[PDB]
Every structure is written in structure tokens, then in C-alpha cells.
Amino acid sequence: MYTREELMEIVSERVKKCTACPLHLNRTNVVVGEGNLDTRIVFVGEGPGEEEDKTGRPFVGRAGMLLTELLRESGIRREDVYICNVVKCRPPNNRTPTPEEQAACGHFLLAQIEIINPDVIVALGATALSFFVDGKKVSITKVRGNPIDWLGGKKVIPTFHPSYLLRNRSNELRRIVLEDIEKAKSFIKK
């Protein structure tokens, strides 16, 4: 009938045609998401930066290369998981997407999670976290590392966005994010 791959391609073609928010006027390429459609763990960030926009691929700039290393140090190959964002189009000057933009784009993310049907989601940063708590503004610093019970018994573990760890190179902060990723892994089923 229809495979996960075909469903994801339908999402991708709809994203490419999307003009539901002002971000479509700014982006060079939409950035849908990448990796393993049978992952039990999905990583979700905010939205594309410059290198993402140029390539159509998520987490390929500086924050993304850091993410690759966090995953490696957590025993995870990027190819084996799925990585995406709340918004699909790069905002002008890489500004934070507005709540209205996040709301317009969010149905695509919900569709990607429905297709993959993971056990656990790692929400990287405040925008991603907001998505999984009905759009509420909530401090990542205050709630990071605490699992959230989301739809269908899926667990969401919020942590810092890798951008933050670009600016603050402390070992303690890195160890905290690695502990959050390991807590995420512990919710993947047998």
C-alpha cells in the first residue's frame, strides 16, 4: 500500500510547496529531516541555519558537527537515528522562529513522528521543548533532563541545544548533555 519511505516523501513534497508562514520567503532549501525511519529515538532541534539551508540537510553546520560528536560519545551513529527540527525553513538572519511560525510548521513534525513512531524523543533546546508542551514558553535550564510523558506513552527528554555548547565549552555542561542522552537511551524498548 504505502511505505514509511513513501509517506516521508509525501511530507517532503508538501514541505517544499509550503507557504503557510513567512519563512518560505527567506529559505533557499527546505530542510525536512534525515536518517533511519526505523529508529526508536528521534532528535529534534529548532530550525535550519545557513549550512542546513544551503544543503537541505539538518545539523550540518557547526552545531551539527558538535551534535555528531555528542552522539558518537553516546554510542550512536547519526545514520542509525533520525534528526529534524520544529521548523523547516531558515529564518532571516537565523533569528528564532516566532511562535506563530512554530505553530504553522508543527503539523509536519507531528507527521514525521507518527511515521517513525519512536519510543523516545530528545528535544534539543527551548523551541523543540516548547513543541512537546503545547507551545508554552519554558526554561530549558530549569527542566532539562526530566522526562515528559508525551502522546502514546512516548517519552521526551529535553536538553540543551548544541549551539549553546558551541559558546560555552565547559566539560561539566557537556557531561550534563551526555547524561540526558543516556537517560533518553534508557527509555528505548528491549
Q: Which residues bind ligand SF4 (CB under 6 A)?
A: 15, 18-21, 23-24, 30, 87-89, 101, 104-105
Give the count of beta carbons closer than 10 Å to the beta carbon of residue 44.
Answer: 26
Nearer to ligand SF4, 87 or 140 (CB): 87
Q: Measured from the CB of residue 83, what is the shortest distance to ligand SF4 in angstroms?
A: 17
Closest CA to 115 of 148, 140, 84: 84
Q: Measured from the CB of residue 97, what is the shortest distance to ligand SF4 in angstroms?
A: 7
Reported in sequence order, the residue ranges of the chain that DSSP labels E, i.e. its strands, are: 34-35, 41-45, 82-85, 120-124, 148-149, 155-159
Nearer to ligand SF4, 89 or 115 (CB): 89
Nearer to ligand SF4, 20 or 148 (CB): 20
161 annotated as belonging to a binding site for a ligand = yes
What is the spatial distance between Cα 96 and Cα 47, in angstroms, rounded to a whole number? Answer: 8
Residue type, position 7, single letter = L
Nearer to ligand SF4, 20 or 178 (CB): 20
What is the spatial distance between Cα 105 and Cα 86, in angstroms, rounded to a whole number? Answer: 7
Q: Which residues contact 91 (CB under 8 A, 6 or more apart)?
A: 23, 26, 47, 97, 101
46 annotated as belonging to a binding site for a ligand = yes
73 annotated as belonging to a binding site for a ligand = no
Nearer to ligand SF4, 29 or 74 (CB): 29
85 annotated as belonging to a binding site for a ligand = yes
Q: Measured from the CB of residue 10, what is the shortest distance to ligand SF4 in angstroms?
A: 14
Give the count of beta carbons closer than 10 Å to the beta carbon of residue 145.
Answer: 15
18 annotated as belonging to a binding site for a ligand = yes
89 annotated as belonging to a binding site for a ligand = yes
How remote is the C-alpha of 35 from its chain's centroid?
12
CB-based contact 104:20 (threshold 8 Å):
yes
Residues flagged as binding site for uracil: 45-47, 59, 85, 161
Annotated binding site: 18, 21, 45-47, 59, 85, 89, 105, 161
In the annotated binding site for [4Fe-4S] cluster, the residues are: 18, 21, 89, 105
